[PDB]
Design a protein around this ligand. Structure first.
Ligand SMILES: [Ca+2]
Ligand SMILES: [Ca+2]
Ligand SMILES: [Ca+2]
Length: 213
């Protein structure tokens, strides 16, 4: 049984590189000199040379920082060969799981979202629902969890802050009375989406609200 438990490595490691991860050891090295090697995507096939193993010592090395959103999991195989050329172990399955950091900003699905209401809708009326996605994890962390907010409203008649947005759903609602198509037939809202549920970084898009006739 030549085996190694799965290894989890956060993306965007600071190093220094190369970074030791685990030492591969065959116990057949008491009988002879052993040369270690690694194969698989990330080792000997694309992306090549992300991982390596030190020939004499069997230290598995990470050569550069990982990116979860490029490759989230690696399956490599370790090999142990004697000086006389015989493989002395069955190849070792080496599992490497890349864990998340918050390194993607949210992205709105559209640059412009449009919706419309009747002029006489009451306060609390839902206008439209906007959406932003985030490529980071949102299962175990907030890296991928978006909070929505309104950035600003034009024009500011009959007053400002006439709309709100649901922080989690992105539903934009009317919160004031005083819509009047004859005075202001359309509002341009700049809307924001922020990750870490409001504590992280932020992107913007526009929502245009038409007051119907
Ligand atoms: Ca990344
Ligand atoms: Ca990430
Ligand atoms: Ca993010």
């Amino acid at each position: 049984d030549w085996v190694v438990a799965p290894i989890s490595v956060p993306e965007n490691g600071k190093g220094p590189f190369p970074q030791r991860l685990n030492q591969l050891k065959s116990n057949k090295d008491r009988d002879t000199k052993i040369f270690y090697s690694i194969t698989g995507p990330g080792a000997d096939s694309p992306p090549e040379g992300v991982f390596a193993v030190e020939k004499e010592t069997g230290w598995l090395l990470l050569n550069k920082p990982l990116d979860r959103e490029e490759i989230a999991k690696y399956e490599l195989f370790g090999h142990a060969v004697s000086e006389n050329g015989a493989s002395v172990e069955d190849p070792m399955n080496i599992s490497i799981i890349v864990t998340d950091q918050n390194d993607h900003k949210p992205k709105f699905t559209q640059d412009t979202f449009r919706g419309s209401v009747l002029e006489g809708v009451l306060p609390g009326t839902s206008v439209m629902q906007v959406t932003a996605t985030d490529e980071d994890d949102a299962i175990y962390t907030y890296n991928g969890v978006v909070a929505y907010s309104i950035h600003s409203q034009e024009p500011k008649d009959p007053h400002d802050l006439m709309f709100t947005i649901h922080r989690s759903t992105g539903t934009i609602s009317v919160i004031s009375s005083g819509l009047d198509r004859e005075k202001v037939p359309e509002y341009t809202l700049t809307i924001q989406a922020t990750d870490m549920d409001g504590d992280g970084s932020t992107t913007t898009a526009v929502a245009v609200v038409e007051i119907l006739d």
